[PDB]
Symmetry: D2
Subunit: 261 residues, 4 copies
C-alpha cells in the first residue's frame, strides 16, 4: 500500500514544461494519473516531451505553444485549460547583469515574466478551484529568493515580489481547499544549466568538468539536483495529503543556502 496522492483524473496546467524543472513536474503529475496541459514557446520540443509523457503514463497531454507573457498567449493557454485543479507557475529568468545597465523596459519585462504573469494565471483559475473545493498552486521560483545573487537583480526583484504576493493570498484561500506554495530550486542538472555551464567554461578558460566541480564544491550535498526529485516534491504538494500546507517556501538546494530559516 504505497502512498496514494489521490489526484488521479485531476487536471494540471504546467508552464514552461517542455524541458527542465517544468518537465519534471509534468512527468511526476502524469505518473500520478493527472491529465496535463503543458505550455512552452517552441512547438517541436513541446510535442516530443508530450509524446514521451503520454507514452510513459496513461493520461492525456495537451500542448500549447505560445508566449504566456502576452495577453493573447496567456489567453491561448487558458483556453486549452480553463478549469485546472493544479497550476504550476514557471518561467525562465532574465540574463545576469548590472542594474546600472537595465532599462525601465528590462524591469517591466522581468516583472511580467516572473511576477505578473503568474499572478494573472492565478487570478484566472483560482475561483474555479474555490468553487470545486480543491486547488493546488505551485510556483517555481528560486533559492535566490532566500539569498539574492548580485548579478540576478531582475529575477531577485521579480521573484521576491511574487513571493510576497503569494504569502498574503495563500492565507486567504486555504480554508476553501486551495493551497499556494513555492518551490525554490538551487542548482539542478538541466540542459539549460549544462549549456550555460559550457558557456562560462569556454569563457573562463577552464574545462567543462573543472567548472562543474567548482559549482559542486559550493553545494554541501556534493551533487546537482535532478528534475525527477524536484517533480516529486511538486507532486507531494499537489496531493490530498498537503491541504494543511500553504504559503510555504521549500528550499531544494542540497543545503547550499546557509540560513537557519
Amino acid at each position: 500500500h504505497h502512498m496514494d496522492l489521490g489526484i488521479a483524473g485531476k487536471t494540471a496546467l504546467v508552464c514552461a514544461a517542455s524541458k527542465g524543472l517544468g518537465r519534471g513536474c509534468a512527468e511526476a503529475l502524469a505518473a500520478e494519473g493527472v491529465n496535463l496541459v503543458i505550455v512552452a514557446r517552441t512547438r517541436d520540443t513541446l510535442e516530443r516531451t508530450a509524446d514521451e509523457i503520454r507514452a510513459a503514463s496513461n493520461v492525456s497531454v495537451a500542448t500549447v505553444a505560445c508566449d504566456i507573457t502576452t495577453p493573447d498567449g496567456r489567453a491561448a493557454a487558458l483556453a486549452a485549460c480553463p478549469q485546472p485543479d493544479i497550476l504550476v507557475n514557471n518561467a525562465g529568468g532574465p540574463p545576469p547583469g548590472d542594474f546600472r545597465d537595465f532599462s525601465h523596459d528590462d524591469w517591466i519585462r522581468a516583472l511580467e515574466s516572473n511576477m505578473l504573469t503568474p499572478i494573472e494565471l492565478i487570478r484566472a483559475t483560482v475561483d474555479g478551484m474555490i468553487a470545486r473545493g480543491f486547488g493546488r498552486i505551485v510556483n517555481i521560483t528560486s533559492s535566490a529568493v532566500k539569498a539574492p545573487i548580485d548579478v540576478l537583480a531582475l529575477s531577485n526583484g521579480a521573484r521576491s515580489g511574487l513571493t510576497g504576493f503569494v504569502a498574503g493570498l495563500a492565507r486567504k484561500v486555504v480554508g476553501q481547499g486551495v493551497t499556494i506554495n513555492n518551490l525554490l530550486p538551487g542548482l539542478f542538472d538541466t540542459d539549460r544549466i549544462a549549456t550555460t555551464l559550457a558557456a562560462a567554461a569556454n569563457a573562463q578558460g577552464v574545462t567543462v568538468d573543472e567548472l562543474r566541480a567548482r559549482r559542486t564544491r559550493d553545494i554541501p550535498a556534493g551533487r546537482l539536483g535532478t528534475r525527477a526529485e524536484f517533480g516529486a516534491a511538486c507532486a507531494f504538494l499537489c496531493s490530498v495529503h498537503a491541504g494543511y500546507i500553504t504559503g510555504q517556501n521549500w528550499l531544494l538546494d542540497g543545503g547550499a543556502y546557509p540560513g537557519t530559516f
Copy 2:
C-alpha cells in the same frame, strides 16, 4: 504507478509514538514497508498501538517502554534499534507558565527533553547512517519555533536550540546521504490536544464546542490538522526523493503563522 518512496525494508526508530503525531509518523512509515521500533513511557498504550500498526501493515513493530530522557532509558531504546535508517525525534513539551516561576531545574528538564535528548539520539545513530550512505532524521518541533508563544518559554527556548543545532549539522552530513529536517506542527487533532482543550473549556466557563470554534477561527484553513497528513509529510521527507532537502523547517499549520518566511 503511484509514488514509490523507496524505503520498504528500512528501519525507523520513532520517539513518543504511542499516540498523536508520533503515532501518525509510525503509521505512515509502516504503510511504506518500514520496519519500526516505537518508544513511549507507558506500556499498555504502546503495545496496543503496535498491535494496530502490525495488523494494518506487513512490517515488524518492536516496542520500548522507557523514559528516553534518561541515560538508561535512552540506552534501552538504542539497544532495541542500534542501526536505524530513519530517526523521528519527538517529545512532549513542558506545561505553560511564567518564566519568573521556572527554576533552574525546570530549564534543565526542558532542555533535556526537547533539545539534548534529540541531539544524543542523533549522535548515537548518525555514523551508522553515514557508513551506509543513507539516513533520514526528522525532528518534530513546533510552529512556536517561528513565532514563540508567551506562556511556552521553556519549549520556545529548548526547541529553538535544537533548531539552531540542526541547521549547522544538516549541511555537514547531507553529502554523505543523510538529511536532517524539522516538521513544525500547528494545532493538530490529537487526544492530548482534545483533553487539553476540555481543560481550558471547563475553566473558561465555555463549552467544548465553543472553545474549539475559537481556536479554529485563528486557523485560516478552518480546521485542525490530522495525524495522517502529518505522517505523510514525514514519510515524504524520509523518501529517496528527498535527498536534496536538508535543514528545512516545514510549517504544517494551515497558514496560521503570518510571516512570509
Copy 3:
C-alpha cells in the same frame, strides 16, 4: 557635561522623498538636527514649502524643495537636478489602496510597482555611483512591516515592496565595501496625519467612534501605542551615521512588537 552621540554627518546632503509630512518629514527633521543639508520632495508645493519654512527655523541647515512626481521620468529628473550628488537618499512613497487582487487591472500592478519598487531603484541607480566615488553613501528605504507579514487586502504593496526588498538585498552586498550602505526601515502603525485621516474614514464607514477604532488597533500592538515620526526619524538618522557602516541589507522592524515572528 556628557558628550552625546555625534553621528558624524554634519555638512552632508540628503535627498528625502515624500518629506512634506509623516515619516518622511520625521526623517528630514532628524537629519537636519545632525547638520545634514536637505533637499525635500513632495508632489504638492504649498505644504512642502511650508514644511521647509518650519525646518529652516528649527535647525541650522539649508533646506531646498522640489515639487514634482518622482514616479515619472520628468519628476525624477527634476529631483536629481536639485540634488545631483546626495550623500544620503531616503526612499518613501504612499502605497496603493487596499482591495481584492481579482478586481485589479493590469495597470494597478504597474502603477504599484512603479511607485514602490522601480522609482526607488531608479533613484538608487542615479545616485549610487557618486556615493561610491566619494567613499560614503547611505540609502534608507521606507517600506512596511507588511513585508514581514503580508495581508491579502494589501496585495499591491505586498508585492511591490517585497520586490524592492529582494533587489536591495543583492545590491547592498555589492557596494558596502565601497562605503555605501542600503537598509530598509519597516514601519508598523505610526501616528501620522495620513493614518488619522484613514482611520476616521474607517470609523465613519464602520459606524464606530474614532476612539473605539483607535483602541481596537492599539490592542493588536504589544507596545500599546502608535509609533512617532520622531523615533522613526531617529532610527533613520542612526542608519545614516558614521556608526552604521557595518550595517547593510538589513530590514529593521519598528512596529512595537506587533509582528510575532522570531525573525
Copy 4:
C-alpha cells in the same frame, strides 16, 4: 551649533557583562558617553579594575566593578548585590571552543547552555520586575551572526544562542507595553583582542602569516574590514535610548553584509 542626538538616558544605570574588553567594553564606553552610570562585570579583577579606571577618566559617570563568575548562582548574586536595580542590562559571554558534537560530553552541552542561555535568562528574571515597576527597561543580548547562519564546528554556541533567541522573542512581546524592550545584537567578525589572539593561533597552526589569514577572512566580508567595538557600542546605545521604545524582539546583524540572506 547642531543639536546632535541626545539618547535621553543620562543618570540611568547599566549592568554590563564581560565588560573588561572587547564588545562589552565597547557597550560600556558608549553608554558612559551618554551619561549612564555603570556596573561592569568580568571574572578577573586586575583587567576589570584597570578598565574602570580608564572609563572613569574618559567620562563623567560613576563606574563600579564586580569580579565574579556570572555562570554560578554565587556570581549572579554578587553582580545583583552591586547593581540591584539596573535600568539597562547587557548580556554578554564568550562562547565554547569549536569541535565536532560527536566528541562532546553531556557536560559540554550543559556548560554551553549555562553560559550562553540560562545565565542571561536568569539575569533578565532578576532585573525585569524593577524595570517594569519604573516603566523603563532596556535589555540587549550580545549573541552572534552564527544565530542567522550556523556552522557545524560551533554546534555548542549555535544551539545555546539560538535557544536564548527563541526565549527572548516570546518575552519581548510580553513586556514592551510596560516600557521594557529586549533586543539582540548579532556581531560578525570584530577587531578585538580575543579575535586577534585566536587568529594568531590559527595562523601558527596553519603555518601561514597573520596577514595572510587576516586577509582571507576579510575576503569573506563584503564590507572589506572587521567591525569595531565602538560602532558596536553605538548600536547598543541607540537600542538603549528613549528613541528605541518601539523596537523589541529584534535581531540586528552587524556583520558587514557577510550573511547573504534577505532576512
